[PDB]
Amino acid sequence: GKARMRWTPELHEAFVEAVNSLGGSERATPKGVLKIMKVEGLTIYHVKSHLQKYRTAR
Amino acid sequence: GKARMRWTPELHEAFVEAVNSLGGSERATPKGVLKIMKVEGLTIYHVKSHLQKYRTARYR
Numbered sequence: 001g002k003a004r005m006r007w008t009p010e011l012h013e014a015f016v017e018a019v020n021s022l023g024g025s026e027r028a029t030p031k032g033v034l035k036i037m038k039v040e041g042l043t044i045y046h047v048k049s050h051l052q053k054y055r056t057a058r
Numbered sequence: 059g060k061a062r063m064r065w066t067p068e069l070h071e072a073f074v075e076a077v078n079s080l081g082g083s084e085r086a087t088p089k090g091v092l093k094i095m096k097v098e099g100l101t102i103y104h105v106k107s108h109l110q111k112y113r114t115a116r117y118r
Contacts, residue, residue, distance in 0.1 A: 016098055016099070017061065019098075020063075020069065020097050020098065020099065020100070021064070021066045021068065021069065022066075022068050022069075023066075023068035023069050023071065023072040023097075024069070024072060024095060024096055024097040025096070025098075026096070027068060027072060058096075
């Protein structure tokens, strides 16, 4: 049904650094995270999905 | 090895909001700020360092 991204350690680490630079999981936006990460192939849909999961995880 | 924890404008703004809720910079504790901010990797030492500077700051 849904295509999922391969969140490697390196990619997840880049994501967490982006989230933190934007003030944390509650303050960061998918678009802001996407803009900071500058990863070829990454999309809003996938960042949003991961950010929602990250918030769920804590 | 390890990233520096940089106090970006957005992370600083989150900090200031937490301090304000705790009654200002002298009344706030570092652990209280840390608990409010919920940022992965942020430690009591990062927040103490920043809060010590902010206590001496003239302006919000």
